[PDB]
Design a binder for this molecule. Sequence first.
Ligand SMILES: [Mg+2]
Length: 327
Amino acid sequence: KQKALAAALGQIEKQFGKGSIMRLGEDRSMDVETISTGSLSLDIALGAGGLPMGRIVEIYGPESSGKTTLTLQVIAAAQREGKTCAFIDAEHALDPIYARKLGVDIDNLLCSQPDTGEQALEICDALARSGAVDVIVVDSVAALTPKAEIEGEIGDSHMGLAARMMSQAMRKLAGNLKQSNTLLIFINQIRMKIGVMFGNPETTTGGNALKFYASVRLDIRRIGAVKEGENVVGSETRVKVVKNKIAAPFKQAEFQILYGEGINFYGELVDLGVKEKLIEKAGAWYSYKGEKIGQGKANATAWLKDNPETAKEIEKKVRELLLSNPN
Ligand SMILES: [Mg+2]
C-alpha cells in the first residue's frame, strides 16, 4: 500500500508533527537553522548538517568521552557565525585554554555558575525568553544539584528530585527556546550504578523530561586512541545520534579528537571525501579533481588544511551528497 502508506504517514505527521515518523533512509530533514558540531561526519549523522537552533539537544557520554570538545566546538562554531553563547556551568570544569584552542571566544562567552540546579534551569529559561542568546550549553545535567539535595533534605531520592527538577522546567524551556530560536545543549552522562539496570542501561541522568523533549540526543564515547608514534595524541571518537527529530536518527559519526587541537575535521573530510569518491586515494597519490593533494591520509589532511578553499569545496559536495535534504 505505497500510496496508503504515504497518506497514513502524512496523516500521522499531520496529527503528530513532521518527522514524528519517517523511513530511516529518507533524505528528509527539518528546515531548521543549524550550527556545526565541528565534526563533518556528525553534522552529517545529524542529517540537517548541525545541531538545530531553537531545540534542546542532549549530549551524553563518559568523562573524556569528547562531549566537552563537542560542546566547545559548537560554541566555537556558533560564535564564528556571530552567535551569542551562554555556558551554564554547574560542573566548574571549563578549560578556557583548551576552549580557545578549539576556537571558543572565551572573552565573549557568557557564563553562569548557578547556586542550584533549579536556578540553573531558570537562568536557561530566562536566557531562552530573552531571545538574545543563540546557544546555551548546560554543563551538566548530573551536576545540576536540586536545591534540596544541596540543603541535605536529600530524604526524597536524588534520582527522584533531579528528575522532578528537570521535568518541571523542560516544557517551558523547550517552548521559549523554540520562540527565541535558541539552541540549548544539555551535557549528561549515563546515570550512576544503583539500577540494576533496567531499563536501557544507557539511561542518562535527570529523568525523562530531557529524554523526550530533546530534538536531538547524542551518545558520545571514546572508542580508542589516536597515536602518532608510540605517543598518544588523541581519542578516536564515536558519536551515535540516538534520537533525531530534525532528520532520521541512529546515524553515527566517528572522528578523532586530537589533544590540544580538537576534532580532526580534515581527517573526516579526507575520509568522507574518499568514501564519496570525491577524493581519489589510489596509486601513490590522493587527489581531488585530478590534482595531487597528498601521499597518505595524513598528508591529504594537512593539504586540505592548507587549502581551505578546496577543503570547503569538498565539504560542500560532501554535504550535498550526504546531508539528508531533498535532492
Ligand atoms: Mg593517485
